[PDB]
Design a protein around this ligand. Structure first.
Ligand SMILES: Oc1ccc(Cl)cc1Cc1cc(Cl)ccc1O
Ligand SMILES: Oc1ccc(Cl)cc1Cc1cc(Cl)ccc1O
Ligand SMILES: [Ca+2]
Ligand SMILES: [Ca+2]
Lengths: 115, 115, 115, 115
């Protein structure tokens, strides 16, 4: 599993469950092409987005639909979504964990990259 | 000044100086129309981006060129840029400050909305 | 003003107003000697804590009463307080800003050290 | 395992390995009594600090020795340590994960609390 995402809720102190996200990859004509999508599980994790063979070098974008998450809790948040954009596998295959910590008016994102 | 940006550097504990950013407004065709841009000052701040008359309700994207900032310091970063996408809504008088705290493999962004 | 504190609220996207804090300096017997205190202003800031003459090298602790802040808003928090412990070292002229970003189950703290 | 700690390094995008920490519990005479200690593993995690029977209601403090971590990497950081203080098990037994994301001049801490 070369690309995993983990989402936490800073207001409830819990994993952020059922958060939708879409992954895009920048194509040669400079447009974002759909690559994968899913929702976080009861542990706030989304696994199995791609495989090592499919996850080639490129620029990738992960859009995390945080607005729908907060709205379903009755909160009207600041951000439309959290956006994480990065170059992947530029120096060979790696495993990427993208983490996001969510509050209504603030979020953080970090990456753990292992070889 | 209805919209200001502040950028900080969590590695050196200083304002992030000379950071370039563009602001976009979402159009009817779901494309990003460039709206404003600048570089942060010696205090890590960017003012004068828009006016009250021009800053109408809509979805806005602030794209912060964090990769060039870290490259200038000789540090290999994870993200291509830091992206802040938000819905601007007229709920009374409101001035927006977007803050971003930068590390090579992590960033946080917060909004302070005051009257 | 060699030492200032700024406190923000990540749930409401506003300065954290009326937050109490104490500052301690570590003594020779490893006890915490109270040094200064105050409450944050309408801008979420606390100034005037110390002077250059008094703010000597040493280890300092800023203890921010975040629990009472969330309790006043009717929100059950995780932390008893937010604690910032740091070594102050004379490396040229230096003014310290301690920032803290608060959520019910999470906090971040940053230092901006400038000349 | 009712108390686990996870530490990440925001500069290298990796778990923070070999980070020491000490856990204290506030005694009836208002002093901090030693409770448990350990170092994070190759995955940045510290497990097996306590058991459900030993981990009674009380106020607990986790001191994470971040200064020694950065110093061993050649960085001179701002903070002496990261301090997390909280009331545990006030409404019955819970499982606590304390997470810390570290940069030289900034850190965040979050708690995931499950039943
Ligand atoms: O608005 C201000 C003003 C001064 C400072 Cl120093 C930090 C912030 C915001 C901020 C604080 C923290 Cl603790 C983390 C990330 C942030 O953007
Ligand atoms: O990956 C995990 C798994 C469990 C937990 Cl509890 C926190 C993180 C990362 C994290 C920590 C902090 Cl302190 C802030 C934002 C984060 O994504
Ligand atoms: Ca309206
Ligand atoms: Ca000295």
């Amino acid at each position: 599993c070369p690309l995993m995402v983990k989402v936490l809720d800073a207001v409830r102190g819990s994993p952020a469950i059922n958060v939708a996200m879409h992954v895009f990859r920048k194509a040669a004509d400079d447009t974002w092409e759909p690559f994968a999508s899913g929702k976080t599980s009861e542990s706030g994790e989304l696994h199995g987005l791609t495989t090592e063979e499919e996850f080639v070098e490129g620029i990738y974008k992960v859009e995390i639909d945080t607005k729908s998450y907060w709205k379903a809790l009755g909160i009207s948040p600041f951000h439309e979504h959290a956006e994480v954009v990065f170059t992947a596998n530029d120096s060979g295959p790696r495993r990427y964990t993208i983490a996001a910590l969510l509050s209504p008016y603030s979020y953080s994102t970090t990456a753990v990259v292992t070889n």
